[PDB]
Symmetry: C3
Subunit: 306 residues, 3 copies
């Protein structure tokens, strides 16, 4: 009764119809207003055009909202960076303080699974940070997915993170990880992570069959589908990856360590590449929304045929 | 039906009244009998005077007891160090062998949450040990709190442990961590850990609002509130911290490693400081009982107003 | 309705009678057909002779089977190595693709616990790999047991793995670990791991009392019983351990690291020792089946006496 579900989303959920959850970060960190709103509308339209209902999730004035109205999407967008970045562990505090929160992967998948949404489209997922051996800095996204039965549709893991260790951690958490139409696990900006995909899926229908099986089994762990960046944005992605490897090199040369390591890398990449990173992120989210919506629709067919 | 709940505690729980869980360690390792009993009575009295019901938890002759009678508290106290230190994973064995067990944070929070107690007052919580990178020695307290929806009221984490890594681990487990009336996460004996508080709460009512939100959301992860040592015991705490840093230094100089590392540190500190450590621990538990009881009462008001 | 339970197993479960779960690996990697089938029959017969019902678990043509018919055991055995090694996170994919899967400890304990089987006999359990500090390579067996209330009957952990870190990890996951009739935690092939047992049990009845307590408490974490290799196979085990320590030495000398480390060790041991490893594994599984069946029967008595 604390959570507000939009009528479009609740009616779809009642009848087993396709719903795609979305997080509130394309909005809080996009282009200058009202361009971030326009991007959010464009992503929701991709979901709608493919036959699913988009369920953008955010917290507004302490109210968790699953499915946003036009007014709510506008309000969220005009707030811009002023919203609290809200991980799962932050939800109760944002509710208690009646704040506005843009939910991360861990928080969004909590709310999506709470109400029975099976497919959550994101950009990337958090992971094991570089030099986690000394810091233990590991995203709660990985824990959350290990104990929430939901499918996350991502473009992989950023090379700023430790991708091999992220994959190992996901194995240990019992998360099924599959690359989409590839034997290589994608990094976010490049298809080349250097890591073999632990498993492979080749169509939205393949994906839906795995989700359907997971639901029928009542497993409490989730699924990560990783969709490699489209070749039409490989130039933008390759630029970011080149800048990232340069930043990593400069970081080593200047002995940047500890809590300053990750923010230094992020900082240096933006100077070299400006807006191309956001452009790549938007292209990735839009690709994930397309394939994620097809997965959700294929799943609703399997559910109908039960 | 295995667990025995005292009539005072069960009647309070039936009516949504304030209850504070307590562990059985102030007793098993306090001053010489009957001084450890007197300390336990003093802590329970602080809870009672503030309008809550104290629920001390222990296992006696294989019977988990939630809420102790006068006879039971006396019996437990006279046993002294003879009781098994009982972590969550030890409970079944202590029950099976019909033993006596003093429950740790992980075991106490299991029993407290089992019966619907929302607030558990402790001294400190276990954590990531120093050089866990080589040992993986990490307290089950952290795991337990990550999957039990209960608030633990603590004075932070001892500097004998690795506080930065403990904080990271708690983030990954989706535990909401907040310092009380400070931007700094407290170490146990000193307010100065060197780590920023990941979040802050400024009153018992703030705390209760977070717990209330967590309950309404049906989140399965818990909450750590960390209350800095009162200035009136900072001298005792500073002495312990000084002795701890000296022991850490001597440990490095004598290359103490592995399973001998943590017990060496504990051993050296006691020689230098004698009884002041226990005095500091008692002051901390009594402070946590005061604030914890106020939190529990404020929470019972929120629940009444639902 | 996706899972097929044999009539013998379902009738036993309905009436609280002794059932022992078994995994499908003695079969997929045993002696040349039909010798692997004969070994599987021999293990099931040990369970039957001791008064319990054997429940071998596998996935055949996408159907999870709990309890195999004569035809199914034969079919599984004739498939040999062609079956997918199926961890818990792989189950949904094997079901979705209608494949054949030999379930590992993590997958088998999921299915066993799903239907109410309390005792699962295996050979060994997976663990923390050597140099996990750099790789984070850790078996999902440990996670799975930390959140599944079932008893696993094993002969310990292989010295190819990092046994001290595996024990620490199990503590953190809240898994009760006990050595059978010893103060030393067994390695798989040798009773000498160099690690003290965190706890000890001295009879099948002791084991059953712990399981019974765990069930009554409704704890969601499981139990690992580790049974040291019988002295009558210590020569075979000692040979394997000697070969393992030699392989470890050669690995260090040739600087084998990363993802090549574990497979190199496994590879070298087989060249030096040929079939004695399988012989030792079979002896261990058969010993675990004997004691595991006694535990299951003793537990069914406790349940009858409730
Ligand atoms: Mn982090
Ligand atoms: Mn420990
Ligand atoms: Mn592994």
């Amino acid at each position: 009764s604390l959570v507000k579900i939009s009528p479009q989303v609740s009616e779809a959920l009642s009848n087993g119809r396709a719903v795609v959850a979305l997080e509130s970060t394309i909005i809080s960190h996009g282009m200058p207003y009202p361009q971030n709103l326009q991007t959010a509308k464009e992503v929701e339209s991709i979901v709608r055009e493919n036959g699913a209902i988009p369920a953008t999730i955010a917290i507004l004035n302490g109210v968790p909202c699953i499915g946003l109205s036009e007014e709510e999407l506008e309000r969220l967008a005009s707030l811009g960076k002023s919203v609290q970045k809200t991980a799962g562990r932050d939800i109760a505090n944002v509710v208690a303080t009646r704040g506005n929160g843009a939910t991360t992967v861990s928080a969004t998948l909590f709310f999506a699974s709470m109400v029975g949404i099976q497919v959550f489209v994101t950009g990337g997922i958090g992971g094991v940070h570089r030099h986690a051996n000394h810091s233990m800095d590991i995203s709660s996204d990985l824990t959350a997915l290990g104990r929430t039965p939901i499918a996350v549709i991502s473009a992989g893991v950023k090379s700023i993170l430790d991708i091999p260790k992220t994959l190992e951690y996901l194995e240990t958490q019992e998360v099924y990880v599959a690359a989409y139409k590839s034997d290589e696990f994608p990094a976010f900006f490049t298809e080349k992570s250097g890591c073999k995909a632990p498993s492979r899926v080749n169509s939205p229908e393949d994906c839906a069959r795995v989700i359907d099986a997971n639901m029928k089994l009542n497993r409490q762990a989730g699924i990560l589908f990783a969709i490699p960046i489209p070749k039409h944005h490989s130039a933008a992605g390759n630029l970011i990856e080149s800048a990232t490897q340069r930043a990593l090199t400069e970081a080593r040369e200047q002995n940047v360590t500890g809590n300053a390591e990750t923010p230094f890398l992020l900082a240096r990449v933006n100077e070299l590449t400006g807006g191309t990173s956001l452009a790549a992120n938007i292209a990735l989210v839009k690709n994930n929304a397309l394939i994620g919506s097809q997965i959700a629709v294929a799943l609703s067919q399997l559910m109908l045929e039960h």
